[PDB]
Amino acid sequence: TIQGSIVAIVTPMLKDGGVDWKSLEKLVEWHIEQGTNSIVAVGTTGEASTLSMEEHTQVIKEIIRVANKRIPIIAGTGANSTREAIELTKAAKDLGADAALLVTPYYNKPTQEGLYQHYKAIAEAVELPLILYNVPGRTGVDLSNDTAVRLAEIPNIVGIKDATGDVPRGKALIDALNGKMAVYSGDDETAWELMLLGADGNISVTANIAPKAMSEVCAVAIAKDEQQAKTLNNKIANLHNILFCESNPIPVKWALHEMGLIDTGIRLPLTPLAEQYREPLRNALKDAGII
Amino acid sequence: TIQGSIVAIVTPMLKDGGVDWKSLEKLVEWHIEQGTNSIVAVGTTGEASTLSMEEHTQVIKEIIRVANKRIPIIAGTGANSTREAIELTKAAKDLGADAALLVTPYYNKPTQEGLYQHYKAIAEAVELPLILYNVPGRTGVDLSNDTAVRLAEIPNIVGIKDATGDVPRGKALIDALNGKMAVYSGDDETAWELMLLGADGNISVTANIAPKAMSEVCAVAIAKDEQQAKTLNNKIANLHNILFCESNPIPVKWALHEMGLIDTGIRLPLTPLAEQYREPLRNALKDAGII
Numbered sequence: 003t004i005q006g007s008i009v010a011i012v013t014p015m016l017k018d019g020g021v022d023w024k025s026l027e028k029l030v031e032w033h034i035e036q037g038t039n040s041i042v043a044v045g046t047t048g049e050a051s052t053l054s055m056e057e058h059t060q061v062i063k064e065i066i067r068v069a070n071k072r073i074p075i076i077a078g079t080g081a082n083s084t085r086e087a088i089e090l091t092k093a094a095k096d097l098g099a100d101a102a103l104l105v106t107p108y109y110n111k112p113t114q115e116g117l118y119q120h121y122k123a124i125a126e127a128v129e130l131p132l133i134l135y136n137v138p139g140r141t142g143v144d145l146s147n148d149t150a151v152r153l154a155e156i157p158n159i160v161g162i163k164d165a166t167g168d169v170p171r172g173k174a175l176i177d178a179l180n181g182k183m184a185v186y187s188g189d190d191e192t193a194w195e196l197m198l199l200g201a202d203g204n205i206s207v208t209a210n211i212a213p214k215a216m217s218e219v220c221a222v223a224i225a226k227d228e229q230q231a232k233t234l235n236n237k238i239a240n241l242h243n244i245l246f247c248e249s250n251p252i253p254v255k256w257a258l259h260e261m262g263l264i265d266t267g268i269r270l271p272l273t274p275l276a277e278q279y280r281e282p283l284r285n286a287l288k289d290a291g292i293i
Numbered sequence: 294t295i296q297g298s299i300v301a302i303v304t305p306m307l308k309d310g311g312v313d314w315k316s317l318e319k320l321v322e323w324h325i326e327q328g329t330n331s332i333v334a335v336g337t338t339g340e341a342s343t344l345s346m347e348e349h350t351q352v353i354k355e356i357i358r359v360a361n362k363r364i365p366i367i368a369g370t371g372a373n374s375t376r377e378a379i380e381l382t383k384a385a386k387d388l389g390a391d392a393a394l395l396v397t398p399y400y401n402k403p404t405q406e407g408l409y410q411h412y413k414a415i416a417e418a419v420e421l422p423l424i425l426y427n428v429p430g431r432t433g434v435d436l437s438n439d440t441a442v443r444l445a446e447i448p449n450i451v452g453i454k455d456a457t458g459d460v461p462r463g464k465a466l467i468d469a470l471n472g473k474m475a476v477y478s479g480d481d482e483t484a485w486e487l488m489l490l491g492a493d494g495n496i497s498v499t500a501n502i503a504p505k506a507m508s509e510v511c512a513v514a515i516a517k518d519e520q521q522a523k524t525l526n527n528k529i530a531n532l533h534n535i536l537f538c539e540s541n542p543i544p545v546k547w548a549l550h551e552m553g554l555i556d557t558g559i560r561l562p563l564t565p566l567a568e569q570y571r572e573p574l575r576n577a578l579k580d581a582g583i584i
């Protein structure tokens with residue numbers, strides 16, 4: 003049921019890597035003021051990989067606290083162990099998250115049936131809406147449309163974040179599902195098109211730095227206004243490219259630092275955006291009216 | 294300095310997924326008796342991803358205990374968090390491991406500089422011989438030959454497991470290193486070839502089921518006997534293929550079960566080998582004289 007612009011929020015950090023709680027609070031308030039419809043806490047963009055289990059709980063807890071029921075909060079709770087995904091998803095439920103986002107198991111390369119059993123076990127263990135997340139380039143595995151369609155029959159499986167950026171494939175998935183569960187874009191470059199074709203929203207990186215603009219792109223695309231969607235998306239299209247010059251969230255964190263919103267903290271093995279990309283990124287932000 | 298057939302040993306499990314301690318002991322003894330030169334504990338093939346922190350420690354401790362210093366034991370200690378990799382590697386040192394094997398951070402896709410800093414931080418934190426491990430199809434990142442060569446300059450980085458299966462590239466890496474650190478094959482299919490070209494051994498999946506034969510393949514290949522290497526590898530070549538019909542270690546665990554050495558336990562999201570593959574597998578094992 004969650005629709006619109008759903009920001010995959012960064013986890014602001016101090017220079018030493020510690021979570022920057024004060025900056026986080028201000029970012030959440032800013033998203034709400036600017037029109038962001040929902041926040042994914044501790045997803046890929048929020049450096050789930052380098053936060054401790056305690057830090058994961060704390061970030062989810064703080065975002066929910068600051069949000070104060072104004073928008074729904076989705077907790078990133080994916081793991082490449084089914085046992086661990088259960089524990090994380092249960093924790094999110096207990097914290098009062100509205101849903102959980104669960105990337106396919108990465109690195110261990112389960113079969114399609116293994117993916118099915120993984121999500122089914124989690125759905126049966128935890129009464130919380132669950133959103134699947136497919137991003138083959140990062141995980142080593144591709145949850146097929148066919149497996150996605152099977153999983154949409156499982157109670158508590160309510161959607162999928164499709165980060166393939168393959169529009170014909172995404173449309174085919176939307177059409178096959180016929181409303182049985184939601185489809186979210188996980189590719190900012192093509193999100194506007196997927197929403198025009200029936201996606202429920204965009205779980206967005208670009209929304210981190212252009213929340214008002216992305217909230218508008220999603221509103222018009224969901225409303226099926228093809229021309230407004232093209233026009234509004236065009237204004238920020240360069241941002242969708244430049245935020246991936248190095249692996250996300252490296253560029254988006256630097257963008258936010260240049261906007262004066264967060265400090266430079268980022269956890270190894272990730273690194274601050276390479277010096278050479280900083281001027282080009284400043285130029286793209288200036289071009290789009292962000293700074 | 295470790296050379297020869299280095300088994301990436303499975304972690305035997307009971308039907309309910311609990312670690313099968315007795316069967317693990319028997320395997321370790323069998324490897325030593327059969328001529329296996331070293332064991333990698335809790336690597337990819339050992340389901341590192343689905344074992345708890347405690348179980349990782351117990352499995353390493355048990356393999357070291359049973360091996361009783363007859364062969365070196367290498368502990369899988371990779372993580373996609375540099376902090377977590379340091380903790381796991383320190384624990385391995387403390388348990389008495391001879392070396393650690395560290396897959397590149399997966400999923401989060403660090404930059405080449407990030408990979409460099411990741412491994413540099415670990416080498417400086419833990420005085421233990423470290424073996425890099427590149428398997429881009431699983432991790433979403435490719436540690437370049439250039440970055441490997443830089444890392445070979447760091448004193449306790451003593452080698453790399455190259456699972457690309459790209460022999461020209463592996464040869465180039467061998468040639469560029471000029472002995473600065475070891476190269477190990479991580480691709481059974483081409484391992485004989487890479488060892489004839491200068492690799493110090495094969496961190497092997499096939500060795501789980503044909504330890505004697507792989508020990509002999511490694512020995513003659515390292516001795517640069519091309520004719521014997523081909524001859525001996527041919528006897529087990531179909532195994533290198535069939536053990537990957539579904540994601541490793543799915544097929545290898547089933548093979549060992551058919552051999553009567555372990556039970557069927559394997560942890561979600563991994564699944565027992567699909568029924569359609571079981572007869573072809575039994576036949577390949579019968580063909581190779583394994584059963």
Ligand SMILES: O=C([O-])C(=O)[O-]
Pocket residue numbers: 010011042045046047048078103135188205206207
């Ligand atoms: O939410 C996530 O997983 C994202 O940021 O891509």
Ligand SMILES: O=C([O-])C(=O)[O-]
Pocket residue numbers: 301302333335336337338339369394426496
């Ligand atoms: O230890 C390992 O990396 C393996 O099993 O491939």
